[PDB]
């Protein structure tokens, strides 16, 4: 079994350039987009066929209305923050909320905000308190903490509602979200410079994107170069890990994916 997650992001931009939406909301299950809304379409829409097939029109109609409300609230919140900081011109405001359902059935829930892409306010649903990065965040923290009913609302949403939505969507998208595409893994020798050979352990075609790749000696090798886990464009991912050789040890690439362990020893 593996962790699954539901996340909703918001981006507000004040005085956006022509085109740039004032407001965007996108939902994700794991790495997959499931929902989109923005200030231009003013519609909440599925971003996955399995969300479209399983949620009737009245779902999208209702969340369309909620998102129009949240869009307006977001615009006011940013305008107020800009006033507090005495900032003119275009600034950004972001929110992320979500939950994880782990293997054991244990859960996490989180809610935070950024201003100009930097941490502003982080929720602690166990102490029912907000971490504020500066004086202006502390001012917002005070207002929010004085509303015990809203904090309790937030705790409940993160712990019960967010998890119930995640399980509903995981079932809808089961064939996409809970499948395994095992990696195709190979080892390349490359002379990177005269008399210097590097070994590349390369993986592609794998889903989910979480993967562990390391190099071992006969012990884990030090100074291992890592490639990012990158989307291949077909719903699968690719990644690599390299070492440079000294001009006698035996080296082996170790890869773990979705509960399968593989070793490529290079002779």
């Amino acid at each position: 079994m593996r962790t699954h997650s539901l996340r909703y992001f918001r981006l507000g931009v004040s005085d956006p350039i022509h085109g740039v939406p004032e407001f965007i909301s996108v939902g994700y299950v794991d790495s997959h987009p499931i929902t989109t809304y923005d200030s231009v379409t003013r519609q909440k829409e599925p971003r996955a066929p399995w969300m479209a097939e399983n949620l009737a029109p009245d779902h999208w109609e209702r969340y369309t209305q909620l998102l129009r409300g949240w869009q307006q609230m977001f615009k006011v919140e940013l305008k107020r923050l800009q006033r507090h900081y005495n900032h003119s011109g275009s600034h950004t405001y972001q929110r992320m909320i979500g939950c994880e359902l782990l293997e054991d059935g244990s859960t996490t829930g989180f809610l935070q905000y950024a201003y100009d892409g930097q941490d502003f306010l982080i929720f602690n649903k166990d102490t029912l308190s907000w971490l504020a990065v500066d004086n202006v965040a502390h001012t917002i923290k005070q207002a929010w903490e004085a509303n015990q009913h809203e904090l309790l609302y937030q705790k409940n949403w993160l712990e019960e509602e967010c998890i119930a939505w995640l399980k509903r969507f995981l079932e809808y998208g089961k064939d996409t979200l809970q499948r395994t595409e095992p990696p195709l893994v190979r080892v390349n020798r490359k002379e990177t410079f005269p008399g210097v050979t590097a070994l590349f352990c390369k993986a592609h075609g794998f889903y989910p994107p979480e993967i562990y790749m390391t190099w071992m000696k006969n012990e884990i090798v030090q100074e291992i170069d890592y490639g990012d886990i990158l989307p291949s464009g077909d719903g699968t991912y690719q990644a690599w890990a390299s070492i440079e050789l000294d001009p006698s040890n035996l080296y082996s690439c170790h890869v773990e994916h979705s509960g399968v362990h593989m070793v490529l020893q290079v002779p």
Partner: antibody, heavy 109, light 113 residues
Framework: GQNIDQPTEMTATEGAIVQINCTYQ??????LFWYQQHAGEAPTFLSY??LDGLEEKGRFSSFLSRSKGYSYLLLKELQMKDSASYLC??????????WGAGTKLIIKP | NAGVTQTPKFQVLKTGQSMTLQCAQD?????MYWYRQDPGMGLRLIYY???????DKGEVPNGYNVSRSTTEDFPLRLLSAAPSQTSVYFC???????????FGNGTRLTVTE
């Protein structure tokens, strides 16, 4: 957001105690509210519960059992001015506000 | 702040007449609501507005319309008065979809042939 039930009417004596019960069935829950409505007047906010347990302010308490789908509004030291309809309501997963038919509380002097 | 101002408090109409119930709030609330209250049932949502510039049907929208061109105002329009519309109407506002409703003082409305 399926169903909500509360008794049509209750009668209690001045100086005593009344527990108004409200049961609800839903898959999805964002909190349960009590409002007070005096005859000919607007409903006014009394209470909000969303976690299990008991909140008290003055002569009024509100309890919520999530597992039983059960709330009560408890009025202590009843006064004639407590004569009123008490409306139970809950928020479903989509913030649909689902209203009980109300309990008319009659206080005997 | 005055809270929610709803007018008129009482109205009689002949079958076929149209009527606008006014509702305004000075609390900067995003949400406004129209309910009818009838004996032996819970408040029934006619229409709501999540924000200035949007509106949506409640549970019993038929025979009514609304507009929300401002934050402050949520007028309810009875298109063609019918006896089934004899009721008490309450306007409400809330800061958010999950916060407490503030109600206007209501409109007792009777429609006679």
């Amino acid at each position: 957001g399926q169903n909500i039930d509360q008794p049509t009417e209750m009668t209690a004596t001045e100086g005593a105690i009344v527990q108004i019960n409200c049961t609800y069935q839903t898959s999805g829950f964002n909190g349960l509210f009590w409002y007070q409505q005096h005859a000919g007047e607007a409903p006014t906010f009394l209470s909000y519960n969303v976690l299990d347990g008991l909140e008290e302010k003055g002569r009024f308490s509100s309890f919520l059992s999530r597992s039983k789908g059960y709330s009560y509004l408890l009025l202590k030291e009843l006064q004639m001015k407590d004569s009123a309809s008490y409306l139970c309501a809950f928020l479903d997963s989509n913030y649909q506000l689902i209203w009980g038919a109300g309990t008319k509380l009659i206080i005997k002097p | 702040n005055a809270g929610v101002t709803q007018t008129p408090k009482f109205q009689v109409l002949k079958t076929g007449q149209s009527m606008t119930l006014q509702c305004a709030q000075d609390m900067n609330h995003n949400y406004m609501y129209w309910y009818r209250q009838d004996p032996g049932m819970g408040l029934r949502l006619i229409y709501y507005s999540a924000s200035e510039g949007t509106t949506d049907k409640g549970e019993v929208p038929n025979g009514y319309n609304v507009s929300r061109s401002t934050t402050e105002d949520f007028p309810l329009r009875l298109l063609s008065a019918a006896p089934s519309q004899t009721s008490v109407y309450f306007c409400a506002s809330s800061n958010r979809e999950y916060s407490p409703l503030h109600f206007g003082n209501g409109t007792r409305l009777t429609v006679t042939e």
